[PDB]
Each structure stands twice: as structure tokens, then as C-alpha cells.
Design a protein around this nucleic acid. Sequence first.
RNA 1: AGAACCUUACCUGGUCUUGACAUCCACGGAAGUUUUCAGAGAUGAGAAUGUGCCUUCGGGAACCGUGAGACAGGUGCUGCAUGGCUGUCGUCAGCUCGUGUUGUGAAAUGUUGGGUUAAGUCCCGCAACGAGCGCAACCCUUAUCCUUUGUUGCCAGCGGUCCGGCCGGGAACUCAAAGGAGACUGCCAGUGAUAAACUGGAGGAAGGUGGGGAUGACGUCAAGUCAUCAUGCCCUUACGACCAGGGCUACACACGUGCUACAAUGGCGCAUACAAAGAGAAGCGACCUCGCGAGAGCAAGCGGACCUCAUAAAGUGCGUCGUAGUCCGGAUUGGAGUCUGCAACUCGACUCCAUGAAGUCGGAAUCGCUAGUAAUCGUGGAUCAGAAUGCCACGGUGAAUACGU
Lengths: 99, 110, 83, 100, 208, 151, 127
Amino acid sequence: RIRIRLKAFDHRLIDQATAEIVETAKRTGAQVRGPIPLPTRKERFTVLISPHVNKDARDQYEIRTHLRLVDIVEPTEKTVDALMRLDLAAGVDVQISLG
Amino acid sequence: VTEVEIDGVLHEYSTKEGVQEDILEILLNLKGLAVRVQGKDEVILTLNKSGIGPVTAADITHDGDVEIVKPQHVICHLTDENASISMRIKVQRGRGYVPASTRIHSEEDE
Amino acid sequence: PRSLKKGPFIDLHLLKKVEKAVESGDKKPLRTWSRRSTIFPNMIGLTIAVHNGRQHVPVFVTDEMVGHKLGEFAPTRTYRGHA
Amino acid sequence: AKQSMKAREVKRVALADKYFAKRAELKAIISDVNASDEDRWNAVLKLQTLPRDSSPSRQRNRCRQTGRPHGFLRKFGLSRIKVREAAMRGEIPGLKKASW
Amino acid sequence: GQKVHPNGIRLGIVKPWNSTWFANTKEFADNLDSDFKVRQYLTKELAKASVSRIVIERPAKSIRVTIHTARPGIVIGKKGEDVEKLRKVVADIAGVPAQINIAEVRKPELDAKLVADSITSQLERRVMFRRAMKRAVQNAMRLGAKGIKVEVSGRLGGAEIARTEWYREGRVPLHTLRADIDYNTSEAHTTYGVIGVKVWIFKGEILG
Amino acid sequence: PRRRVIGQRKILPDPKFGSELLAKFVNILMVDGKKSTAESIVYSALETLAQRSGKSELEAFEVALENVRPTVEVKSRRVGGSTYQVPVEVRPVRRNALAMRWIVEAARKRGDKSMALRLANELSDAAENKGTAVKKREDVHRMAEANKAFA
Amino acid sequence: NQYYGTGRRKSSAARVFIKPGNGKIVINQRSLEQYFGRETARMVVRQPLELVDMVEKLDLYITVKGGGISGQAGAIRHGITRALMEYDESLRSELRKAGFVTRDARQVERKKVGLRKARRRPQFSKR
RNA sequence: AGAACCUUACCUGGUCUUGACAUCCACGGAAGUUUUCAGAGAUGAGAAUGUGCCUUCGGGAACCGUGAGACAGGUGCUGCAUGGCUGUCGUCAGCUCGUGUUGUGAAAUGUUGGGUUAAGUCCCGCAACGAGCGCAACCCUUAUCCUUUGUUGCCAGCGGUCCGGCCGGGAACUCAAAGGAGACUGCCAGUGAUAAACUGGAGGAAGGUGGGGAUGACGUCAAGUCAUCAUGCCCUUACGACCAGGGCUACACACGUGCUACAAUGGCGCAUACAAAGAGAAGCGACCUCGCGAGAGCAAGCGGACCUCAUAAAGUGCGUCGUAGUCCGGAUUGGAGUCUGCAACUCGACUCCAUGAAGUCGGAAUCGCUAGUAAUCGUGGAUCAGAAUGCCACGGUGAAUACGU
């Protein structure tokens, strides 16, 4: 089975990507597993915002890396190849893995 | 076909290195194209080819949800083996007839 | 202290100098900056003027000084008293 | 930071890049309990001979824009001050002010 | 240092990011550095061309730049001569295949950054700062800004004691997150010193 | 506070006897949010006390409490140049609390070994009308009496 | 046939199932006395049942995750209450009166920059 | 958001001077690759390979070498020349403007007054009428529900069992995200000026801003920062650059902020239960073997809801100690060692064995906190080779009190 790991910072974008991938899968092949949402990584950062000194002065940023696990149960001839030409939107790191 | 983007081009009335049809001929032969998308409503294809011989429509590096149903539609006739052509087509979806003059200011997305 | 498996530490150059001295049988003081160098059995008898940051202070090596380092016998700070 | 400091850092990095294979090998030799004493000694001495700037524990992480040694972040390669600026500008992707 | 950055507070809601890519902790710093480089280069090059926003977007080991500029003609030059030139240098800077797009900025009086730049330029060529500020404000208003504020600070008219002066017109709500507040800044490197120019331009509120 | 009076928060009755007062006492006793240990101690105190005086566990405790509750406490107005301590009638909710607190203090003070044992002893004393808490109560009363002129 | 209610309190998440029976409580394949060593916890889990005389009438299978002991107990209680509500739907008023239907929304307040804790400010001095 | 070296800006010596870092020509050499002796090292002297993209051949672009200067360089001075960024009063409810009107005018009015509010919040009046910046709302998070999607997450009901959700499976539940619903004084009664509101109650997961965060008006302090950065006199064979060693860790003393204690609500021993949130490829490193232990060896699983860090601790049960400077307390010092690292002397952390200071709740005075708060218990992260009792995060247990001004 083809496991697909979508990773992105924007959630909407990721969602869009996932849908597209599903569409790509579903026309060619059959029995797409589904878009399973894994836990989001909220990598936080604190920094001092003064140039020199004021330690209680701080900004707390974060990067929300979202995960989408799409799986394809039956890899056909037509389906797997379809993704080669079918590149997804920018800012979405995909990671296909058969078996 | 709505917008055609050829590399190393200034306007549509120029000419290019290594081809037969001129650029107005290429735009007419691209206006005759027959595409069938499934999921999206606006896609971008890619055509890249070098070498002596005609450029069919079957040489476009397709994505998954686009289907080019005329694999003998000719576009160019590449004559020089050192010549290349890399155009990026944009395929919308609508109805009726919307021409270039009205679509000269209608287009909002700068 | 240093690990037993690693052995004792002595600066290579310093060691060489010591060897040379031994060969000679001379007793002129060897000015040295290697304060981190451990003292060796063969170094016994030699005067070796160890740097203290500022100046080289003469250290006549003894049987008791072997396990120790050269910087132990060359104090850097110079405090007499507050009054 | 100064230009000079930056240059020094660069040099150090270069040295590290150069001498990695040898240094690592030497380290391995030194570690290896199933080995000769003399060999080990040689290795130890050999290491000393190699340049100091060849060590990776010599090089300090500085900001890639300003060269500021302190307040550094690894993910961005930038000092806090610059990082913040980047965030404000939209230049770091995904990064926005966090509240919870 | 009272105020929060108006762009920065709104990135999740009404404002988008400039650099728009994903990368793991491994390649992220490098990417950032590259972005910084390319942007810097672009600024250096297209100073005379009125450039507002460089948007970098890298998918699949290939960098896509998008230059928002008021006059494409000077950035493009002859059709695909200057752009092409820019591209290879961009690629070099990055170390990947480059692709430059050029967005045409409609209404450069309403783009805040551009306005700021203009003001700075004016300052440099020894105009009355106040008159420049007025012009900036007025023009924006005319163009259909719901509001605009501009602020200039330090060594105004080469005076020994530095001060800040600012002109607002219309409404410029900063606490309101859903307000499209185009904020940007610039610096006039005059004979007496630097003169920092801030400008806030309120396009309107977004409803979603 | 200035602006608004607020409703006292909900307190659960203890699992052994099903009493609010007991629970409150336990809470008072507690330190570092170690409730369980404190409650155990309280239980121990009760049991020993029960053994000593007969009656029930709860009833005895109540009786003990009764002998250390203050009718009247004092507060410092100080309107003049020197300070005047003024008596005030101390309300039902507060009086109960105060007695408990005093008892706890006494227990803490006491020279016996285990905490629970000490507590038990204190309770016994209260019941009999000798000890530390009782003394404190008397003192409080005495002060009030002294300053009865102010009202 | 088995009825159900979800329990939640602090970071705990109980899964209470109500069935008709004799009144044996199992929490993660362990008895009430085994799982909760604390009496208070036991009391809290039995509270709702005590309030509406169905202690002997119904068995309940529970599995709980997250939080500590007291929190877990609370969650369990909540779950039980929910189950009861589902099952009868005429005991709601009593439950409301008790204060068991209410999800106790008290979470731990986050630590805040500047402060050592949620509210503890560091030691101040003019000099 | 981490001084052994480095960092480093300081000291001591040893050295360099178009230079460590750039651009420019001139012309000597392809770059680079390997190795040798002296030296603390910086540097100062040797042996091997190569000639790629192009020439009506006066040669070129990358990358070393030498000399000239143009210049580089400066964590040098001025934060009282500046920008930017920051603190602060203060998340205090304020601060203004246009037009009108009043006053010779500075100014006033609006913005005051009656009520009310967390709020210049809202209503009513009124020479004001309007507007803006702020007080509110929009944003994140947390509390309830529903829909969607179910692996690496889950196990209600089914069968099988090595009694492990592990394996058939199931999509219920938890959980995971994505999208919706929900709270508005909307509904009820009373008080109120026919009001804005207030007081209570109904429902509800939540009630009157539900809890928390982000958000900081005009301005103030010639507040802080020229040593992040940028920027408007001074040094330029040295106030620049390279190096090794030392110092920033000094110690009659005074203050600030913390940790650990002084014990029995405890210490010690044995058993045993319940978290959250994070990090991880020059990385996290199971299992197994060895070591009293720090660790060592071997070495899977894993860019990770999968594997690893990783046993939560307080707690609970049973035993012991019995108020002692103690089976409290752990400083200090001796020995021996482990790991990181060219390198632990100055000056790392941790381990083992020994040693066992002061300290029995702290003078004048003084700080924090109104709830999942304080108090207490552990856990993680950043910087980081190594080096936290600090900082930033996470959950566990979990109070007291608020009469009032």
C-alpha cells in the first residue's frame, strides 16, 4: 500500500493538497484509504525583543507543522504513475512510500 | 487554452530559433487544442522538447488529472537539433466566447 | 584528574627538552610555559623555570614533585595582604 | 560582530571540513580498547599535532546576517533580534506570534 | 517600544507570508539565508524600479521569485532581456533553478512601502519633509485609502535636537486584527543622519 | 475587596463521616497541598479522641471546637492619635474557622511526637477546658472585655 | 443494550459504560478498591450513584486515561453522570442540583514569561 | 538561550602591515591535492600532480603569489547628533481633531451634568454637531456538542488466543485535526427616569468580558542600547590583523535574586499506582552483556501519534528510626574514577568510598499570591562537545481568606 505523508505550515493549503491527491488517486485506482490527520507539531520559540537589555520583554513565536496521512490500498499501473506529472502546490512537502 | 508562456519571447509577432511555424501560427495551433481536466478548474501544463522533428500534442508532460485527447495534434516543427522550446500553457474552464480585448482589463489577478 | 587509560600529560616539546638536558648532564634552567605538563621521574634534579603569566620562576624538581604538574609550583596571583 | 571575527569563524569551519576524516579516525583509534598502547599514544600525539581550528568544538554559532555570538537560534541560523525582524516581515515561513 | 508590528500580528488572518515554503529543521536555516541573499540582491538592483514586495516560493528544488513592482517596464526592460539576466543571478545566489515572475502593482500611492520609499527619496534630495508627508497622505486619500498614517523621525531639517512628526488622515485601526493595514518602513540617509519613515495604509476590513 | 462581594466556593464533605466542618478542618491542617496525609492525621486524632472521651468521633470533635470558639474578637480602628482596639461580634462562618485554626496552631506548637497524637491531645484539652487554644480564646475575649467601652 | 457517558476533568478522560446488574465497578480491569487507593476518590466516583439510588441496580465498566488520581476520579464521576442522563433522562434535575452535570473547566493556568509560575511574581525590591 | 580552548571584546609576550575580511589593475603561477624540519603556535624553509571553458595567438574567467597605491579594518568616542528596537507610568481609560459657538486673548465648549459600566461602556439631558486614536469586538487557546476522516491512535460488541489490542476485525468510545453549532442579559421576574442598566433564576458544558493569552492610545523619563544591526570625530607599521598562555572564575567585606536545609504533615528501606508537554540524524539510542555506580561494549527501531530520550515524583501499603545537632542536614575536604573535549592545573559535569560545617524556623524590617491561584511534587525544551539551583514551557496534588474601605 502507498502511504503518503503531507507536511505543511499552512493548514488550509495542506487540506487543499490532500483533496487534490485524493482526486488523483480515485479516478485512476480504487479504494483510496482516506485523509487521516496526525498530530500537529507546534514548535515554539521564545526570544528577547530588546536590542540590549530587558529580559521580561519577550515574543513567543511558533511554527505549526501539520501532518496529513493519505494511504492508497491498491496500487494499479495507471494510478501510481499519475502523481509523477501531478505536482502539488508549493509549501507542501509530500512523502509517498509504497509498502 | 487561455495564456501561453514561451521563454525568451518579447511579443507574439516575433519569431523563434529552430522552429517552422511562427508564433502566431503556434498560438493558433494551441487555440485548437482539446483538453479534458477532471478535478481542478485551472491547471498549468508544460511542453519541453528538443531535437529535429515535429512537436505533437503527445509531448506535453501531463499531470494526473489532465487528459490530452488528441495525440496527433501538431504544434511546432523543430528543425535545428540545438533548438529548444519550453512553453507553459494555462487552461481555464468556462463557456461561450471570451476574447482577448475584453479579457485585457477583466482579468483581476494582477 | 586525567583518566588512567589516557596516561600522564606532558607537552611534547617540553619532554624533548628534558631528554636533551638529561643527555647533556647540564643544570642550566629551562624556561618553560607548559604549566599543564606533569612532572616525570627523569625531570628530578633539573631546574625548570615555569611561567606564572608574568615571569619564569625557577623550580628545582624533587622526588616528591613527580605526580604533580609544573603550574602547581609557580603561583600566578600575587596577594600580600589587605593592610 | 566584526568582519575579522566572521572571517576567523569561516576559517575554522573550513578547517573542520578539511580535517574531519582524519580527526575522527584518530579519535576512534584512541577510543578502541582492543588496540596497542604505543599506537594509542601515537594517535594521541598525532591529534595534538593537527591544527586547533580543525576541532568542531572550537567554532561558535553566530548569526548568519550580523555575526552576533549570543542569542542564537539553530533552526533559523539567526540571532534573536534578526529572527524577530524576519518574523515581523513575513520572511520566516509559518512563524507567527503564539498565544495559549 | 510600545507598538506591535502591524504586518506581524496579522500573518495568520488577513496578511500572508512573503517566503512561502516548507522545510525540515535541516534545510530551513540555509533556505532563510538564501532568501535573505536573493532579496538583498533584488533590492540593490531594482532600487530605481519601484519595488514593493519580493515573494519567494520554492517547490521541488527550484526557486520561484515573484517581484511586486509599480513599473514592470524598467524591471523587464526589453521583453525578456532584463528578467532573464536577473534569473541566472538569482539561481546562482540560491544554487538551484530560478524562476522570476513580475506582478504589476496597481495604485503605487496606496502601497505603503512604495510611498515610504518615495518619501525617503524626497528627503534625500532636500525637500521640506512636512510637504512630502502631506503629499503622501493626500495622494493616498485621493486614490481611495480608507485611511493612511505616515511618521517621520530624527534630524528633521538638519536640526540638532531630533524629533518625530506624523500625519494621519481617515481611520487607521491597528488593534483591529481584521483590518487590512499595509505597514512598511524606510530610512533616508541624509547629510545630517538617518531619517526613518513609517507609513500605515488602511485598505479596509476583511469579512470572513 | 472594593468592587464586589463573591459567593464562597463549594467544599466537599469528608469520605469517612460525611461532614463539611471536618473537611474544612482537614484542609486547614493540610500543608503543601498534601491533603491525603493531613486527612489521615485528622482521622487518627479523631479515633484516639473518641477512645478517650467516648461519645462519637464527630460529636467529641464538635464539643472540643465549642470550647475554643470566640463570641467576640477585636480589630484596630486607630481613628485617634493612638490606636484603639475595638470589639466586634464575630460571625458564625468565621468563628468556627478561627477556633479550628487556633487548634491547629496549638497542635503545631505541642511537644508530643506524632502530629496526629498532638492534635488529639489538643482536642482533649479543649473538651476539658485547658490547653493552648482555650487560653488563646480567653485572651481574645479578655481583650474585648477590656476594650468594651468602644462600640 | 449498555448505556454510555464520556468523562472529562483536568487532563483525564474516563469512558464509563452503564449496564443493568448487581453493582460491581471495574476501572481498567481492576476493582474500585484496587485502582483508587484513596477514599475521597472512591466517594467521588460513588457520589452520583448515591444521589440517585441505583448503586445495587447497575454494573459499570470504566476505562480512564490521563491526569492524576483526583482528576481521574472526577472525570469518572462526570462520565457516570452522563451515562445516567442518557439512560433515564428524568434524573437530570437532581444531578444539576448536586453539581455533577457541570464539566469542571478548571485547567492548570499556563506559566507566563516574567513570572516564576501562572501568577507567582518574582521577589520585588525597591533597592 | 550557557566564559576551559574557542567565545573575547581584556592582560602578557611572540608576530603581520594594502593587510584576517572586499573591489581594482599590473604581471609571476592553473586552482587544489598530498607530505618534511624548526617553532608555544602564528609562521618560515622542502618533495609530488595538473595546464579546463578560447585565440587575424599585445591573452583571458575561476584560485594562489608579489609590489604600488586608491582603500580595507576598528566590540574606538558621542544613545546629550540619530534610525531601529526596548523598558516605563499602564492594558491605566484616557488623548485629540474638524466645523460651529463663547471669550480682547491664553483658552473654553465638545470631553461637563443625572444615572450606569471593567471601560470617554451605554443611555438621558445639554452650544454643540460630528470624527479619529484608544475601550469593546475581530485573532490564538481553553470548557460542551455535532459532522467528516480513522493510522502509527482507539477497543464498545463480535470470534480466536502465547491473556499483550496482539490478530481477524470493528468503526462505536477516547484521541487526533479540519469544518460547523453554542452565550447574546437572548428568555423570566423585580428595581429603575416610559431608560441605560442593576439584582436575582430558568435553562445550559459554560452567565453576564465564561478562564487564560496576544493586543500597550496621545505622550512621559535628552529612560536603555553607537558592543546585534544601521547611522551623522578619532586611529591607520596601529585604537587594525594572527598566535600561544593567562584573565573575565581573583576575595577583609556589603547588597540583590535563587536552591537546600533546620526535620516525624519527616528521614531511610522494600513493594506499588496515576501525567502532560516536548526533543531527536556530526542526533535520540531499546534490548542483551559487563561495571557497586557515573558509564562501557555490542547494536536494533526511528527525520518519528510507530522507535528512542523515558522509570514521572509527590502519593499508596508494609517495616523501621522516637525529638537527639539525630538514621535531621548536607557544606567542606581526602582518595579513586567516568564522560565530553587537541586539552578539564588555573576552571567542567557526573559517579563511588570516606569526611559530616553552619543550621533547632531567622533583628529591624520586607516580598508574592483571590483558584486549579498560592503552596508543594516531579517532567521537558532552548543555548549546548561538555557545562543550570537560571530562563522558557508541561502536567500532578492542591489550600486559606476577602467583614469591609
